[PDB]
Amino acid sequence: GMASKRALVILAKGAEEMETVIPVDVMRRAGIKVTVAGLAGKDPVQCSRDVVICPDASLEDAKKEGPYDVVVLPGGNLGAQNLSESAAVKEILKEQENRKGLIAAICAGPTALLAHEIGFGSKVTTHPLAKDKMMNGGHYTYSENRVEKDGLILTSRGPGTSFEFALAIVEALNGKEVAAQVKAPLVLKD
Known part of the structure; x- marks a missing residue:
């Protein structure tokens, strides 16, 4: 039916786990193929409030499997700092911007x-x-x-x-x- 879409979620140590999981889950509910990619590799990631999430892939691997229809950056102060320091993230975001893809x-x-x-x-x-x-x-x-x-x-x-x-x-x-x-099954307030 409709065009298949793909999302890259870049998961760094110190990410806000709610801001990671809610978009992953909601995008999967929408039929989007979401790749949770660990900045540091495939190892489990310790989020800001100590929830530990296992990525689907390393960023190293996932970055080679694009392009993606959206690149998603969770928050969390330390997670965002880690994203900010990464040359790999820089290259992914520049490519996405050049391609006129959603960020x-x-x-x-x-x-x-x-x-x-x-x-x-x-x-x-x-x-x-x-x-x-x-x-x-x-x-x-x-x-x-x-x-x-x-x-x-x-x-x-x-x-x-x-x-x-x-x-x-x-x-x-x-x-x-x-x-x-x-949205409807989520029981949001409005």
């Missing part, structure tokens, strides 16, 4: 866009506490929307916006009707 980042995650000089001049949001880091240099325009989207740059604010973020990714890739169908 989605939540909470502190968008600060890795700054680190890798991705999407300058777009409207973005972040966690309130990550605003100052994101806005250093004035390279983006800040938004307080729970989810923000400016062209191919899709951002969101925190654990409590993760469902909205995920469903925005679904809407961008598979359309509004799929997003609405996936």
Whole structure:
């Protein structure tokens, strides 16, 4: 039926586990083929609140199996720092931007866009506490929307916006009707 879509979720030590799992799960509910790729390799990843998640693949392997319809950056302060320090992440994000592919980042995650000089001049949001880091240099325009989207740059604010973020990714890739169908069984407040 509809075109098959693929997502790369880059999972670093210190990632916010809720911001990782909610988008993975919701995107799989939408029929997206999601690869959870460990930044450091295939070993289990210790997230910010000590949930330990086993990646589907190393980033080293997953990066060779693209391209992807979306690249997703969870937050977590230390996770986002790790993403920001990675040359592999830099290369993946630059390729995705060049290809006009969706890039989605939540909470502190968008600060890795700054680190890798991705999407300058777009409207973005972040966690309130990550605003100052994101806005250093004035390279983006800040938004307080729970989810923000400016062209191919899709951002969101925190654990409590993760469902909205995920469903925005679904809407961008598979359309509004799929997003609405996936949303209904979740028992979201609105």
